[PDB]
Enzyme design. Structure first.
Site, PDB file in Angstrom:
ATOM      1  N   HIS A 177     -22.500  -5.650  44.652  1.00 19.54           N
ATOM      2  CA  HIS A 177     -21.472  -4.662  44.259  1.00 19.54           C
ATOM      3  C   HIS A 177     -21.861  -4.012  42.926  1.00 19.54           C
ATOM      4  O   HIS A 177     -21.605  -2.820  42.735  1.00 19.54           O
ATOM      5  CB  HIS A 177     -20.135  -5.398  44.127  1.00 19.54           C
ATOM      6  CG  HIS A 177     -19.090  -4.594  43.440  1.00 19.54           C
ATOM      7  ND1 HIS A 177     -18.366  -3.611  44.083  1.00 19.54           N
ATOM      8  CD2 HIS A 177     -18.697  -4.588  42.152  1.00 19.54           C
ATOM      9  CE1 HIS A 177     -17.539  -3.049  43.211  1.00 19.54           C
ATOM     10  NE2 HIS A 177     -17.739  -3.618  42.006  1.00 19.54           N
ATOM     11  N   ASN A 203     -15.841   0.887  46.160  1.00 20.92           N
ATOM     12  CA  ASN A 203     -16.605   1.623  45.123  1.00 20.92           C
ATOM     13  C   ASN A 203     -18.027   1.078  45.128  1.00 20.92           C
ATOM     14  O   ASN A 203     -18.196  -0.107  44.803  1.00 20.92           O
ATOM     15  CB  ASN A 203     -15.991   1.486  43.734  1.00 20.92           C
ATOM     16  CG  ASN A 203     -16.876   2.086  42.658  1.00 20.92           C
ATOM     17  OD1 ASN A 203     -17.573   3.088  42.893  1.00 20.92           O
ATOM     18  ND2 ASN A 203     -16.864   1.489  41.474  1.00 20.92           N
ATOM     19  N   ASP A 225     -11.416  -3.478  36.489  1.00 22.31           N
ATOM     20  CA  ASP A 225     -10.601  -4.525  37.160  1.00 22.31           C
ATOM     21  C   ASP A 225     -11.025  -5.923  36.704  1.00 22.31           C
ATOM     22  O   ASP A 225     -10.334  -6.884  37.093  1.00 22.31           O
ATOM     23  CB  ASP A 225     -10.613  -4.391  38.683  1.00 22.31           C
ATOM     24  CG  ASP A 225     -11.986  -4.319  39.325  1.00 22.31           C
ATOM     25  OD1 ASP A 225     -12.948  -3.916  38.657  1.00 22.31           O
ATOM     26  OD2 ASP A 225     -12.062  -4.623  40.531  1.00 22.31           O
ATOM     27  N   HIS A 241     -17.853  -8.931  36.223  1.00 20.28           N
ATOM     28  CA  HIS A 241     -18.735  -7.755  36.032  1.00 20.28           C
ATOM     29  C   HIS A 241     -18.028  -6.759  35.126  1.00 20.28           C
ATOM     30  O   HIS A 241     -16.944  -7.075  34.611  1.00 20.28           O
ATOM     31  CB  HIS A 241     -19.213  -7.153  37.361  1.00 20.28           C
ATOM     32  CG  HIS A 241     -18.187  -6.519  38.234  1.00 20.28           C
ATOM     33  ND1 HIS A 241     -17.378  -7.245  39.076  1.00 20.28           N
ATOM     34  CD2 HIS A 241     -17.895  -5.210  38.462  1.00 20.28           C
ATOM     35  CE1 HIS A 241     -16.606  -6.424  39.758  1.00 20.28           C
ATOM     36  NE2 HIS A 241     -16.908  -5.166  39.400  1.00 20.28           N
ATOM     37  N   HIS A 264     -16.713  -3.713  35.382  1.00 22.60           N
ATOM     38  CA  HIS A 264     -15.713  -2.714  35.820  1.00 22.60           C
ATOM     39  C   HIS A 264     -14.325  -3.018  35.250  1.00 22.60           C
ATOM     40  O   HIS A 264     -14.059  -4.137  34.807  1.00 22.60           O
ATOM     41  CB  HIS A 264     -15.673  -2.602  37.344  1.00 22.60           C
ATOM     42  CG  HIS A 264     -16.859  -1.904  37.909  1.00 22.60           C
ATOM     43  ND1 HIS A 264     -17.263  -2.079  39.218  1.00 22.60           N
ATOM     44  CD2 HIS A 264     -17.731  -1.028  37.352  1.00 22.60           C
ATOM     45  CE1 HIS A 264     -18.328  -1.342  39.452  1.00 22.60           C
ATOM     46  NE2 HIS A 264     -18.640  -0.688  38.314  1.00 22.60           N
TER      47      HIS A 264
HETATM   48  C1  LIG Z   1     -11.997   0.382  46.249  1.00 22.88           C
HETATM   49  C2  LIG Z   1     -11.640  -0.964  45.663  1.00 22.88           C
HETATM   50  C3  LIG Z   1     -12.017  -0.950  44.196  1.00 22.88           C
HETATM   51  C4  LIG Z   1     -13.258  -1.467  43.641  1.00 22.88           C
HETATM   52  C5  LIG Z   1     -14.287  -2.228  44.368  1.00 22.88           C
HETATM   53  O1  LIG Z   1     -14.846  -1.786  45.462  1.00 22.88           O
HETATM   54  O2  LIG Z   1     -14.538  -3.351  43.947  1.00 22.88           O
HETATM   55  C6  LIG Z   1     -13.161  -1.274  42.207  1.00 22.88           C
HETATM   56  S1  LIG Z   1     -14.376  -1.573  41.133  1.00 22.88           S
HETATM   57  N1  LIG Z   1     -14.558  -3.146  40.799  1.00 22.88           N
HETATM   58  O3  LIG Z   1     -14.145  -0.865  39.895  1.00 22.88           O
HETATM   59  O4  LIG Z   1     -15.553  -1.158  41.816  1.00 22.88           O
HETATM   60  C7  LIG Z   1     -11.927  -0.536  41.952  1.00 22.88           C
HETATM   61  C8  LIG Z   1     -11.370  -0.094  40.618  1.00 22.88           C
HETATM   62  C9  LIG Z   1     -11.362   1.384  40.392  1.00 22.88           C
HETATM   63  N2  LIG Z   1     -11.317  -0.421  43.162  1.00 22.88           N
HETATM   64  C10 LIG Z   1      -9.984   0.219  43.367  1.00 22.88           C
HETATM   65 ZN   LIG Z   2     -16.470  -3.488  40.464  1.00 21.54          ZN
HETATM   66 ZN   LIG Z   3     -13.509  -4.355  42.284  1.00 19.88          ZN
END
Ligand SMILES: CCc1c(C(=O)O)c(S(N)(=O)=O)c(CC)n1C
Ligand SMILES: [Zn+2]
Ligand SMILES: [Zn+2]
Ligand SMILES: [Zn+2]
Length: 232
Positions: free
Chosen positions: A149, A180, A88, A84, A86
């Site tokens: 998500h 998130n 990460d 996706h 984001h």
């Molecule tokens: C809280 C764990 C989390 C998530 C998540 O819930 O997947 C994501 S994401 N893929 O950006 O939404 C992050 C990056 C900021 N982080 C730290």
């Molecule tokens: Zn995400």
């Molecule tokens: Zn994530």
């Protein structure tokens, strides 16, 4: 504890974890909003090449990922899929592209990454825009379970190894409240998880976007957490 924990991976280091023959997770960490989080992706052997699933969350982690792959596996990463839009998942796409990796995402993911100001994978994955759509990508199947998500989230199945990479649509057991959810579809997320269960009921290993792997029990766990969040 054999699986590397957020606590054991210093700033800008990447661990590999062999889940099965020719399947690894990659684990990296970043500080976000005052806490340290781990983040998982996948590596799948593709003959004498490697398929990468997701960046290691940012350019510095993604450079370290490529160096760890060279040290521990020593085969070239030729393609990457981001599951996706984001940071990460796509943060580090430019590092991959500079290293001659062909970067892929759905047109949905590419559209949302451009809106967000995140890195944009070069190549487009066709045939994943409808809930329940599956396409082959070499040694994996890509599946779009529906909005969860994020509206664009994909899951990745390795049929040789019965490994289901759930990405950020699936929560680890130790997560008992929402991560998130700014971009989430809470109304559809449980329906989308049930599509994953119905498509991959043979899965033996389930890898969440963040934290420890488990089995298909992670799907029910995530439904429980999403429903509790919905009812806040
Ligand atoms: C809280 C764990 C989390 C998530 C998540 O819930 O997947 C994501 S994401 N893929 O950006 O939404 C992050 C990056 C900021 N982080 C730290
Ligand atoms: Zn995400
Ligand atoms: Zn994530
Ligand atoms: Zn190309």
């Amino acid at each position: 504890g054999e699986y590397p924990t957020v606590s054991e991976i210093p700033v800008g280091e990447v661990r590999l974890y062999q889940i099965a023959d020719g399947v690894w997770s990659h684990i990296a960490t970043q500080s976000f909003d005052g806490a340290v989080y781990p983040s998982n992706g996948l590596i799948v052997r593709d003959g004498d090449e490697l398929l990468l699933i997701d960046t290691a969350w940012g350019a510095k982690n993604t450079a370290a990922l490529l160096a760890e792959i060279e040290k521990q596996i020593g085969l070239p990463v030729t393609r990457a899929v981001s599951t996706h839009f984001h940071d990460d998942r796509v943060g580090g796409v430019d590092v991959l592209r500079a290293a001659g990796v062909a970067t892929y995402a759905s047109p949905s993911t590419r559209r949302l990454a451009e809106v967000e100001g995140n890195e944009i994978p070069t190549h487009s994955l066709e045939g994943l825009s409808s809930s329940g759509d599956a396409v082959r990508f070499g040694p994996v199947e890509l599946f779009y379970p529906g909005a969860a998500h994020s509206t664009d989230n994909l899951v990745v199945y390795v049929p040789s190894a019965s490994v289901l990479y759930g990405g950020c649509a699936i929560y680890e057991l130790s997560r008992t409240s929402a991560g998130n959810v700014a971009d989430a579809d809470l109304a559809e997320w449980p329906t989308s998880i049930e599509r994953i269960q119905q498509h991959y009921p043979e899965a033996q290993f389930v890898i969440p976007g963040h934290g420890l792997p488990g089995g298909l029990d992670l799907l029910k766990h995530t439904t429980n957490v999403v429903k509790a969040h919905t009812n806040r």
